[PDB]
């Protein structure tokens, strides 16, 4: 009972779209996979860690010839790996060294909003700075940072801003996991881009239904290679693309083990020979290369396209061994006096809507009490023939899946999730408990759909501990 299918509906994959373009071989030689260094703290006082993160412009050598003008956090493209630990408090200085407004959103982080959350209510102006403070109150997980200024998010991510973020805790520490960063533990941020005289040009490539790129850009590198020197490797996959889905597998269908989802370690490790990710989903995977011989090249693909080359070195054979259960996920329970909240995604291209509306920065579409678990029922009304899979995301929480069209959820969806692909004609039920007060967004994570307005806000409140929010209209740009 290894999983041997992608877990979304094939009738609706990206490649059914009339504008779809498959990935092509990028020019130049093979390069070692870039692995970002961890961000060093500025100061440590008690359980209080100080970081600084700066959005900035630079030049990154990507393709043969001229370098590519890009944006990055603390560097020219992407960002450093940022480590958080459950129970610690962080003071993070957010500097904007670009010439337009950004925000710093910690996708997957349980943090109050709408200011610390770094969605569209939290502009950092050009040359400006904002400071946030927060305590991490969720288990170990792979999460990420990216910008969120409505309606410029898609372009900003295109231009290069995204960083991988790791939360660790004692449980994950207790496991015997590959942990030599850049040697047997890798971030794998999957993106796709097109270039024009080696440069980015979002406006040229824009599609309102989701912008696709011609080349595969992995951690900001084209034609990547990994030298395998220890056989058990952890790969922290993130779909960081604006729209493209990634259907990941080894060329020979060599099995691997999913150990984690968006919001953490899964309750049991899942053996599979392939996995599909929609926008913003994460899968934390172990691969054991021990059955290959030194000098072999093992190729990870998406669809039939060569994605990363693994060069097998002088490799002493080893075995994985994971406990069962892998982790304890506490079940949320709902009050059973509480109704089901229904939200409906509909349309494609510029006709996308969320409950028949487009986002309004001043409109609070829904409310829900802090610490109360509620069932949400998320629907996509696109046709089975011709529709698309919309990745649905909620800020400020991790949720659990109950069912997909009344049947069992996918086998890698029994833990904590924050982004969920919703297939055409499908109805998915989740359980959602908000643990922090504030205003949070929920939306499609196809960036162009988000920017069109396939997005809504929810106010999370404590009765007799109320607060009034002074939501502003969007600045006139």
Please write down the HEC assignment for all residues of the chain. Answer: CCECCCCCCHHHCHHHCCCCCCCCCCCCCCEECCCCCECCCCEEECCEEEEEEEEEEEEECCCCCCCEEEEEECCCCECCEEEEECCCEEEEEEEECCCCCECCEEECCCCCCCCCCCCCCCCECCCCEEEEEEECCCCCEEEEEECCCCCCHHHHHHHCCCEEEEEECHHHHHCCCCCCECCCEEEEEEEEECCECCECCHHHHCCCCCCCCCEEEECCECCEEEEECCCEEEEEEEECCCCCCEEEEECCCCCEEEEEECCEEEEEEEEECCEEECCCCEEEEEEEHHHCCCCCEEEEEECCEEEEEEEECCCCCCCCCCCCCCCCCCCCCCCCCCCCEEEEEECCHHHCEECCECCCCCCCCEEEECCCEEEEEEEECCCCCCCCCEEEEECCCCEEEEEECCECCCCCCCCCECEEEECCCCEEEEEEECCCCEEEEEEECCHHHHHHCCEEEEEEECCCCCCCCCCCCCCCC
Q: Find the shortest distance in angstroms from Cβ 157 to Cl ion.
A: 23
Q: Which of residues 65-84 bind Cu ion (CB under 5 A)?
A: none
Residue 446 interacting entry, from Cu ion, Cl ion, none, C-beta within 5 to 8 Å by type: Cu ion
Q: Which residues bind Cl ion (CB under 5 A)?
A: 306, 309
Q: How many residues bind Cu ion (CB under 5 A)?
A: 6
Strand partners, 94: 53, 130
Interaction between residue 449 and Cu ion (CB under 5 A): yes
Residue (139 or 210) nearer to Cu ion, CB:
210
Residue (274 or 429) nearer to Cl ion, CB:
274
Q: Find the shortest distance in angstroms from Cβ 224 to Cl ion.
A: 6
The single residue among 82, 167, 422, 446 that binds Cu ion, judged by CB under 5 A, is 446
Q: Find the shortest distance in angstroms from Cβ 30 to Cl ion.
A: 6
Q: Find the shortest distance in angstroms from Cβ 317 to Cl ion.
A: 25
Q: Find the shortest distance in angstroms from Cβ 306 to Cl ion.
A: 5
Interaction between residue 444 and Cu ion (CB under 5 A): yes
Q: Find the shortest distance in angstroms from Cβ 300 to Cl ion.
A: 8
Q: Which stretch binds Cu ion (CB under 5 A): 157-165, 171-179, 423-431, 443-451?
A: 443-451
Q: Find the shortest distance in angstroms from Cβ 467 to Cu ion.
A: 22
Interaction between residue 121 and Cu ion (CB under 5 A): no
Interaction between residue 12 and Cu ion (CB under 5 A): no
Residue (390 or 429) nearer to Cu ion, CB:
390
The separation between the first and the last C-alpha atoms of the chain, rounded to the nearest angstrom, is: 55
Q: Which of residues 85-114 bind Cu ion (CB under 5 A)?
A: 107
Q: Which stretch binds Cu ion (CB under 5 A): 177-185, 371-379, 444-452, 458-466?
A: 444-452
Q: Which of residues 379-438 bind Cu ion (CB under 5 A)?
A: 390, 395
Residue 309 interacting entry, from Cl ion, Cu ion, none, C-beta within 5 to 8 Å by type: Cl ion
Interaction between residue 193 and Cu ion (CB under 5 A): no
Strand 297-302 vs strand 246-250: parallel, antiparallel, or unpaired?
Answer: antiparallel
Residue 95 interacting entry, from Cl ion, Cu ion, none, C-beta within 5 to 8 Å by type: none
Residue 306 interacting entry, from Cl ion, Cu ion, none, C-beta within 5 to 8 Å by type: Cl ion
Q: Find the shortest distance in angstroms from Cβ 58 to Cu ion.
A: 26
Residue found by looking up tokens 């005289």 in the block: 197
Q: Which residue is nearest to Cu ion (CB)?
A: 444
Among 73, 29, 145, 417, residue whose Cα is nearest residue 258: 417
Residue 390 interacting entry, from Cu ion, Cl ion, none, C-beta within 5 to 8 Å by type: Cu ion
Interaction between residue 445 and Cu ion (CB under 5 A): no
Question: What would the two tokens of residue 319 be?
Answer: 């075995």
Q: Find the shortest distance in angstroms from Cβ 298 to Cl ion.
A: 11
Residue (309 or 311) nearer to Cl ion, CB:
309
Residue 214 interacting entry, from Cl ion, Cu ion, none, C-beta within 5 to 8 Å by type: none
Provide the binding-site residues for Cu ion, judged by CB under 5 A: 107, 390, 395, 444, 446, 449
């Amino acid at each position: 009972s290894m999983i041997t299918k992608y877990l979304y509906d094939e009738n609706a994959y990206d490649y059914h779209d009339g504008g779809y373009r498959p990935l092509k071989k990028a020019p130049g030689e093979e390069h070692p996979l870039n692995v970002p260094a961890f961000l060093k703290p500025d100061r440590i006082e008690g359980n209080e860690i100080y970081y600084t993160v700066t959005a900035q412009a630079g030049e990154t050598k990507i393709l043969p010839g001229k370098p590519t003008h890009t944006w990055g956090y603390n560097g020219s493209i992407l960002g450093p790996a940022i480590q958080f630990e459950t129970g610690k408090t962080y003071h993070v200085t957010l500097k904007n060294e670009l010439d337009e407004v950004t925000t710093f959103h910690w996708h997957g982080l349980n943090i109050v909003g709408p200011y610390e959350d770094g969605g569209p209510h939290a502009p950092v102006y050009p040359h400006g700075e904002r400071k946030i403070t927060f305590t991490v109150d969720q288990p170990a997980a792979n999460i990420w940072l990216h910008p969120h200024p409505c309606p410029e998010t898609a372009r900003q991510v295109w231009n290069g801003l995204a960083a991988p973020v790791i939360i660790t805790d004692g449980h994950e520490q207790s496991l015997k996991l590959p942990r030599r960063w850049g040697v047997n533990d890798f971030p794998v941020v999957l993106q796709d881009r097109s270039y024009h005289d080696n440069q980015l040009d979002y406006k040229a490539d824009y599609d309102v239904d989701g912008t696709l790129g011609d080349y595969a850009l992995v951690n900001g590198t084209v034609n990547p290679v990994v030298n395998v020197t220890k056989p058990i490797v952890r790969l922290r996959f993130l779909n960081g693309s604006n729209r493209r889905e990634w259907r990941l597998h080894f060329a020979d269908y060599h099995p691997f083990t999913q150990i984690g989802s968006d919001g953490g370690l899964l309750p049991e490790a899942v053996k599979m020979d392939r996995i599909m990710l929609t926008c913003a989903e994460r899968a934390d995977v172990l691969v054991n290369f021990s059955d290959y011989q030194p000098g072999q090249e093992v190729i990870l693909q998406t669809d039939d396209f060569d994605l990363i080359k693994f060069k097998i070195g002088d490799i002493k054979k080893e075995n994985m061994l994971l406990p069962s259960p892998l982790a304890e996920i506490p079940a949320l329970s709902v009050d059973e006096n509480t109704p089901v909240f229904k939200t409906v995604m509909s349309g494609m291209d510029d006709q996308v809507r969320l409950d028949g509306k487009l986002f309004d920065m001043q409109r609070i579409d829904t409310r829900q009490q802090v610490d109360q678990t509620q069932i949400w029922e998320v629907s996509n009304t696109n046709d089975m023939e011709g529709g698309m899979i919309h990745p649905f995301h909620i800020h400020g929480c991790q949720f659990q899946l109950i069912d997909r069209n009344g049947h069992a959820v996918n086998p890698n969806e029994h833990g904590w999730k924050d982004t969920i692909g919703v297939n055409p004609n499908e109805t998915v039920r989740i359980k959602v408990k908000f643990t922090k007060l504030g205003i949070f967004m929920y939306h499609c994570h196809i960036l162009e759909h988000e920017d069109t307005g396939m997005m809504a806000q929810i106010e999370i409140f404590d009765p007799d501990h109320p607060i009034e929010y002074h939501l502003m209209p969007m600045n006139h740009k």
